[PDB]
Every structure is written in structure tokens, then in C-alpha cells.
Design a protein around this nucleic acid. Sequence first.
DNA 1: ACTTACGGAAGG
DNA 2: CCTTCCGTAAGT
Length: 815
Amino acid sequence: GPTKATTTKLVYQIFDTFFAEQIELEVGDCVSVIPLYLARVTALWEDSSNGQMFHAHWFCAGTDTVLGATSDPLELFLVDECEDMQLSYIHSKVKVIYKAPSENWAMEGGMGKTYFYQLWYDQDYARFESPPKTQPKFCVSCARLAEMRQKEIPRVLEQLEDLDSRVLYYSATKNGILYRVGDGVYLPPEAFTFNIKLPVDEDLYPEHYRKYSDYIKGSNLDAPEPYRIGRIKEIFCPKKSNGRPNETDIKIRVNKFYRPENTHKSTPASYHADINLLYWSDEEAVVDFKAVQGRCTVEYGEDLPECVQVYSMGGPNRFYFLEAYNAKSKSFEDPPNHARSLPKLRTLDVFSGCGGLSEGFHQAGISDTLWAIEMWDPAAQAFRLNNPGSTVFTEDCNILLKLVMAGETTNSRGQRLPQKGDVEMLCGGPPCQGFSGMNRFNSRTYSKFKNSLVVSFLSYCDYYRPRFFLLENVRNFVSFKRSMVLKLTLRCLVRMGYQCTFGVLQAGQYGVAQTRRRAIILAAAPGEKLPLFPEPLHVFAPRACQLSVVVDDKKFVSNITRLSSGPFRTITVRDTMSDLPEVRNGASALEISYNGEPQSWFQRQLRGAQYQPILRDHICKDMSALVAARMRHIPLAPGSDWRDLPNIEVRLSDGTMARKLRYTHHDRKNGRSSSGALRGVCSCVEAGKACDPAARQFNTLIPWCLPHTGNRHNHWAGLYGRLEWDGFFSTTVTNPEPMGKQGRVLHPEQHRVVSVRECARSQGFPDTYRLFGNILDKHRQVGNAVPPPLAKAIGLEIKLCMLAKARESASAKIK
DNA sequence: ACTTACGGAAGG
DNA sequence: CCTTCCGTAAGT
Ligand SMILES: [Zn+2]
Ligand SMILES: [Zn+2]
């Protein structure tokens, strides 16, 4: 059975009613204004001709934030909103306090009635942050709004030369980024062009009529192109009629760079190439400075001090070129000479799994997971196999929390439990089963107790008061129960005094060939910086990139600006597993050999550089003889699934002949097929009638349940579905089942289900990452994990915050 | 331990 | 109307 959630008293009185059965007049004075709105009087300076005036810096009541009615009815939030008001609208002086965190805040975990505030609120991004420290009327909202309007205006600097038609400059600046002549720029795909010029037989296939959408899952036909890369040759402004430069119409000239897929050698040229490889060209373009989407580093390869592979991993936006590309000669050249020239956090991972989140955090260099809690024994053993210096408690998290909230210091095994002050960062993905939209029993006690573990996680965060807090869940976490779970999580975090925010990320935008949307809740201690969410690194299909959240009919987006394009191309199924040798249905050989070297950039990243020929976990589930014949009869065309299975009699791998599915009832919605045949397999096709417990047909190559219930299940699109080489995986789940809800798990060519190795590669796991158990345990460990590249992007975002805080401390101490 | 049959809300 | 996709419970 499931254990009830351990709570601190703070967390208890917020989630109490939801998990009932599952938890165990002077400047500086605040006034009220008839709508009442609570404002702070920032200045009482009498403006003329309009009576006595005053500047009102508005408060936002917590009920007007994303918290809603979950909020404290006296909590206010600072907002960047103010305006000039008459004095004939002030009702009376109201008392507002600033509840500041104590110096013992990191240990306040575990233990009037006037208006108060403790956090500033960003209403677009739902970001609760520490009150901004803007040092001086002096409206803070006005100062922040000014210092914001003055960083988005592109401005030239360091005039280089003055001709008669245009003024050249050496530098420009835009959105706080500085560009110089010679830097690399990102540009929208539309910024410049390259000189290179770019009937079914309804009686044999009776379920084909259900493919009438033309939409193909995991298809990369509509993904946008990555950024155009350029090198700045000339920053210039055109002169006006007054003979002086137009400092607002800033133009740049650019040497174009080719990607290998941009040359006459098309997309196939990208299969083996480095994801950041370019070709210098002598072609030039002129764009507007407004079009620049970011700065990037484009270096000549064989003039770098280290190896180009060591340069590529050093920082973001790093590209190199070794050769030039003659377009209309369609040749490759040597480039011309005018083209050549902190202590890690202590981390506690609750619901660790095999360790995908810890792996991504480790490769971002921010964290050292010293403690992991994981009840399932195979996943905990895999964590131990991947983290030899970590402590893994193979125990219910509630039991361990109860132990630590007393002076236990040690569990029944002799494992030293973390105490307050020891945990610097708390991360975890609480169980998703009760939140996942695939779960059609989410109102039952099993899913109730699964969902109640969010309260356990928040109680951990309340007790330990870590510097940073990360909650990962499926996308459906943000909308489950009218977003009440998310609202209550954010309410608990604000009540603790955390700066907090939430968002939805797509894993495919960070370097996996998989669509996987995950909700992320980030929180930081009062003295910290609140991390931003990471910018997408890889372009991905737009249908898989729906990341906005509607909470009480209000839309919330993350801070991400790279909506459409990005620096790198998409990872495909070919990039993922094209190197792996052929294998059969039911593979059981754990350690085998690779039949050669890695064939793509992604495979090179996942295997490493050193020659290690031992490939592990290239094992496939053993499907029955009927399922095997079905997987043999799935054609290789992209978008092939059960719906183009043949309705024939098949001599199976044993002494058994699969029969033809009989169509016994007239489906009125689907109508009759062209041959006059019926399309229903049970009496329930008629609206308002019970199933006949005799229409269930057995041992058919076409599964009977799929036509039985397809009309209300999107025709079971994707079931017995093959992957395509040019496309991406669907969401990797704990068990690849051709008849599962997410059942597009068939190899592009081999008559088998995807391998454990291929599922780990869809999740961005290093080939050396150890999994444990039988094949089902390995599939579940892989399908539960956070994809390490996504956790790495988030970790780099937190590293930014750590470095920022350290630098401000060092500047404050070396005055 | 293995196989199958399969609800309903969010958001486009 | 179409697509979403850390899956569960009952049967076997
Ligand atoms: Zn103001
Ligand atoms: Zn029926």
C-alpha cells in the first residue's frame, strides 16, 4: 500500500483540503484608491492645472496574481506598474509592511493581520522575485521601466570612418549585447539566401480509411531552418538629408556562412557533420541590426589553440569552419587569409530514478548529488551504478522525512541522513502517473496517493531550505485539477518566502530526437537570483513546441525568446541510432560489439572519443508470434501503423494460423467500405447500446479492440507505428508497447520493437550510462528519466545565477 | 507475470 | 473536430 505524505506544518495548512485522505501623507506611505487598489505614494509633488497630484506605485494583491484565491488575502506583491493620480481618489492611509526574510531563514523550516508584501511579481512570466534593489520622487517602477526601455534600443558606438553616403562604426549594442566588426551574428532564416539554387484495396486493407489526416507523428517536414550565421564585415548607418548618420537605421554587412546542408550537397551532407560546422563564403549580405537574433563565435578551425572538439564544448554559440565553399563552382577551398583571424552545489534528488536529472546536472558542472531517494530497487541500483560517491536511500520518501524531522541522524541501515544546512539544492521529479493524461484512472486512490507525493517534495523543500529547488513533472501538471496543484505548489513556495516561477519545456529543443514536454518549477532562496529558463538550442517541429499555460483563463509563458528558430539543426532518428547493428525480436545479448564507429555528431557525443567496442543494452522485448507477424506486416513507409495491416490469414511462427477479422456490425459513422462491407466489430457501434460479449474476436492480425474503440481515440493513430529515419521519437514511456497508448515503437526497418539502447539514445543518455534489471526494468528506468540534455540546459541556467551571486559578493567584499 | 482493452480534459 | 502520450486495471 501507499504511505501518506509527511508534512511540515507550513505545507500542511496549504494542501490540507486538497489532499485530505492522503496527507498524514508622507512619501513612503501606502494608500487605498477607489477602483480598492492599494498603492504606495512615491511622490506628492503637486502638478499644476490638475489639482493636487501624486504618483501611485501600484501593489498587486496576491488574488490578482497566478496564486488566485489560494493566496493570502493580506499579501501584496510589488509590480512594475505606476501612474499619476488625482488626490481626490485616495480613500485613506492603509498600513503595509515589508515582511523580510530573517538571517535564520535557512533554518526556519520545521516548527498581525495587516497588509504585507515580500516579493515583486512579473505578471507575464509569473515570476515571484526578491524586491528589486534599485538605489535612488524615486518611483522604483519608473526607474526599472526606464532602464528596461533603454537596453532594447539598438545604438551604435565607436565611429570608425565617415564617408559621404554612410557612417561606419566599430561597435553596436542591442538588448545588452555588444557586437563588433568581426563578430558572428544569428539571423532569421529569412535574412539572406545562398548563391546555391535549391488507390487502396478496401478489402485487403480495411482499416486504411482511418488514415485521413495526412498528419504524420514524429515528422520533421515542417520544422524551421536553424539560424543564418554571419560574420560582421561593416557596421554602418546611412546618412540622412542633414548629412548626419541615421543612428536608428543601423545596417550591418555580413559574410555569409554555409552549413553543410546549405551547399549543393543537400541534407545528406548533415548526416555525419559536426552540428556546429560551417563553410566560409565570400558572398555578402546586408541586413538590419534589428534582425540580429544574438551574438555567436565563428572561428577558423585550424587556428584554434586547442582541438576544435575542445573548443566546441567550451561555451554556447560556438561554431568553426575549416574550408571555404565556392557556390557557383560547387567546390571546397582553403579559406582566404582575410577570414583567419566555483564549488558545486550539494544536491538532494528525491525520486531520483536511474539518474537522468542528476546526470544532466553533473554534465552542467553545477551540482554534486550527495543523496538520492528512490523506493524502486532497480532504479536505485542504477543510480548507485552511475553515482559511486552518492548515498542512495532505497526507502519511501515519507519515512525518511519523518526520520529527519526528528533527531535520527541515521536510518535502519546505517546511512547518514542529510540535516538542515547540508542540502544546497533540492531537485526531483515526483511521480507523474497520476498527472499523466494517459492515466484514465486518475481519480482512484492509487493515483491520489501518487499525486500526493508533491506535498512530500514540498515538505522536503520547506524543511531543508535549499538555495535552489527544481520540480519536474509531465506537462499535464500545470493544468491538472484546474491548475490547483500548481497554484498550491506556488502558494506554498511563496509562503516559505521563495522566489519561484514555472514553465513548460520541450526536450527536443535541447538535443534529443524526441518530443517530450515537461513542466518545470524553479525556486530560489531570498538571497539568490531566480534562474531563467534555458533558450532552445535545436530547432524542433512547431506542433511539439506548444509551451504556454492557461491558469484561470490567463496565459503564462516562460522567458524564452527563441520561439521559432535556433542555432542548431534538429536531431533525427538517424542521428540517434543509425550506427547500431541489426538485431532480432527478443534480443537478449547484453554486451555486444558495435559494427563500426559512430556515424553522426549525436552518436559521437553519446559514445565518446575513445575506441570502446562494447555496446550494452541493445536488447529488444520478445513479442509473441502473432505480434511478430503483425510487426512483419507493417510497411516501411513513413506514418505506417496498424491501420495499413492486411486483413488476411497468416501462418504464424508456430503451428497456428491467425484468422481474418470479421466485420459484424454496420458502423454508421464510418459507413460501409467501397465493396459494401461493414466496418464495425461489435454492437457498440450504435449510439447508446451495450457491447455484445461475443463480438470480441481473437488471434487476428488486425487487433479487434482498435476498430472497436478507435472512433473515440483518434483512430489509435501511432499504434504498431514505425519510426522514420528523418523524424523524431514520440514520448519515450516506461514500456514500449505497439498497442500501448503511445505505441509508435517499431524500428524504421527491422521487424522488431525499439531497443533499450535505442530508447536511452532517444532520451539523450550517454552510451556508458548504466541501467539495471530485466528488460522491463531498463525500459522503465529509461522512460521515467529526465533527458540529460534538458537537465544540462537548466543546470547551465542555474550556473549563471551562482556565478552572478558570487561576483556580486566578491565585489561587495573587495569594495 | 504477461496481455489486452481503453476515459476524458487542454489546447490548437 | 484533431492531437496530446513519465499509463492502469482487469483479465489471463
Ligand atoms: Zn513611477
Ligand atoms: Zn463494443
